[PDB]
Every structure is written in structure tokens, then in C-alpha cells.
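In this section we walk through a basic example: taking a raw amino acid sequence and producing a predicted 3D structure, encoded as C-alpha cells. The instruction is simple. Fold the sequence below.
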Amino acid sequence: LQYPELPLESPLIDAELPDPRGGRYRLSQFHEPLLAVVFMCNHCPYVKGSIGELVALAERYRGKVAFVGINANDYEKYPEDAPEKMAAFAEEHGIFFPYLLDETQEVAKAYRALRTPEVFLFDERRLLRYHGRVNDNPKDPSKVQSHDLEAAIEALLRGEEPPLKEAPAIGCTIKWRPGNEPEVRIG
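The resulting C-alpha cell sequence is shown next.
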């Protein structure tokens, strides 16, 4: 067994990373009741088609759910995902929350993340309650039939358990640096 996904109820894995727009942020510094950590990037059409919703959710849940975006992509191979581009992407889509660069890709590895966008939602005790897709059709809002992340957040706000059926991330694979490709083994 190699690179298994982070199981539910697992504690938040802390990280301190820089935002290309300025400053550094620690995942544990956010004290809102809920915390949504989203591995993303700029180039991926799945992120492009769902970022509007992600930002809208962050806006609606200000003070209730803290959002943090993390780009761990190899920007030498994917120039559109470069730090300068991240700042421009944040401005273009109104990403008011922190959008962090994971240069070494170690945070993505620690979370055993595989795609963009991939969300990890934590509760008040900072234990993993929902892991997976933003919705069932990230690349095309017009074709979405399920808003998985919104449903999970609303469930948690009501003290309910999010949907039992796992809804894994839907999106482009994270762009690993040469030699950083996770050797996933089911057993």
C-alpha cells in the first residue's frame, strides 16, 4: 500500500507557505469553525470552471468557513501556473482568500493529493470531514447536477454528517516535478 488518501477524521496537516501577492500563511492560523483547503492551479479547466463557485462559497461563508488555495504545480513545465500568474489569476477571479505556492510539492504529498481542484474540509476540531470534488462537473457549471462541497459545508453547519457516499476529486492531475510522481499502490 502506497500513497493512500487521507482518511476521514484525520487531523489537519499544518503548513506554512507564501502567497505570491505578498506575505506567508500558516494553515493552523485560520480559526473559523470550518476550514477548506483546496489544491488547485491556474491552467486546469476544472479549476477555471469552478473557481467562480469556490470564490462565491468563500464570500457567502466569510467568518464561518476559511478557504485556502494551494498551487503545487511544476510551473517550469506549466508556465501558466507560475507565481506571477497566480497573482493575476487571483485578481481575475476575485480570490480574496490566501492562494499559496507549494514550491517543493511536500504539502501536496503530505495530503496525498492527486488532482486540481481537490478539497479537504475540516471541522472545529480540525478533523477531516469531507474530501473530494468541488462539484460533479467542475469544468462546466452549466452541466453541474451536484454541488458536493456546498452540501458538505451546509451539513456541517447544521451539525449533520455530510453524504456517506464518497465523491472523489474531479480534475486535472497535479503536475509533479521530475521524480516527485507519487507511486500509488492499492495494496
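Looking at the output, two observations stand out. Residues 83-93 form the longest helix (11 residues). The longest strand covers residues 34-40. In the next section we compare this with other chains.
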